Design a protein around this ligand. Structure first.
Ligand SMILES: *[C@@H]1O[C@H](CO)[C@@H](O[C@@H]2O[C@H](CO)[C@@H](O)[C@H](O)[C@H]2NC(C)=O)[C@H](O)[C@H]1NC(C)=O
Ligand SMILES: *[C@@H]1O[C@H](CO)[C@@H](O[C@@H]2O[C@H](CO)[C@@H](O)[C@H](O)[C@H]2NC(C)=O)[C@H](O)[C@H]1NC(C)=O
Lengths: 50, 50
């Protein structure tokens, strides 16, 4: 709990590694939400039921 | 083949593990089938061709 962010040489690789993961999830969400929000415009009964 | 489902303490963790995998696949299929079925309603020639 004390030793976590105190080592720049350990944390620098991690910020880049996890930062890329966070960005990947954002790109998937924007892609999926766009398709889902267009489908609900056409058939809200099916999308709501699912 | 004789031992498989005989040890409850081994099988209980497995049912809880694989049950989640099966549920995850069901959720993906319902999501994908719904989008695919709406696209098919709009352009059957493209969806059938692929
Ligand atoms: C990352 O988190 C650490 C805490 O783990 C932050 O470091 C503290 O910063 C304050 C303000 O200068 C100091 O008073 C503390 O002594 C620091 N704590 C330790 C354990 O070093 C740090 O500011 C954060 N980094 C960024 C860029 O936000
Ligand atoms: C899970 O599979 C096992 C078989 O591996 C089932 O256990 C058998 O149950 C019948 C009915 O009580 C017994 O006659 C057998 O002797 C049992 N076999 C063994 C090797 O123990 C079990 O019934 C299945 N689980 C469920 C929910 O029914």
């Amino acid at each position: 709990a004390r030793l976590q962010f105190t080592y720049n040489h350990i944390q620098r690789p991690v910020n880049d590694m996890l930062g890329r993961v966070a960005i990947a999830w954002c790109e998937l969400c924007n892609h999926e939400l766009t398709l889902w929000n267009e489908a609900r415009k056409l058939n809200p009964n099916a999308i709501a039921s699912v």
